[PDB]
Amino acid sequence: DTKLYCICKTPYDESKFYIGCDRCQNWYHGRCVGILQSEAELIDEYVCPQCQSTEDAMTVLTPLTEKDYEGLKRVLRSLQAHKMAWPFLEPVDPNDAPDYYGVIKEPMDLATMEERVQRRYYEKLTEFVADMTKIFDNCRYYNPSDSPFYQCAEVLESFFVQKLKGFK
C-alpha cells in the first residue's frame, strides 16, 4: 500500500489510530482531525473536516428544494415583520427619495423578493442572499452613514445573517 492517507499525506502506520470518512472514504489519524479513539466509539457516520467544509460552502450552491422554499418564505416573513424593516417593505417611492433611481441602478425590496419566492425565481440560495444583500447595500449607498435608514440596514442585515444560519 503506497497510498498517502490523512491530511498529513503519510503512509499507513499500523501503530496509530485512524478514523474513516464515509464521505470521501480516505482515512485520517484521529489526532490530525481532533478525534479521540474512545470518542470514535460514540460516532456512527463520520465526516472529516475537509468534507464538512466543502459541504458547508456547498449550501449556497445546491438546488433549492421545496422544503428550502418553505424556509425562504419563513425567513422573508421574519424580516418583513422586523421593526427596522419598514424602509424596505416595498419599492422606494421617487417622491420620497430625491433622484433615488438616478443613484441606485439595481433597486430591490422585500415585496419584489416575496414575489420572486412565489414564482420560484431562485434556483440556488446564493441568488436569494444576493437580492437581500442588494437591499442593504442600496440603502447604505443612497443614505448617509448617520441616517436612521442606514442603521436600519445595518440591523436587518445582522438579523438576516443569523436567521440564515443552519438553513440547509
Partner: peptide, 6 residues
C-alpha cells in the same frame, strides 16, 4: 464509525 486500531 469505521476505524483502524493499533
Amino acid at each position: 464509525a469505521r476505524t483502524k486500531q493499533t
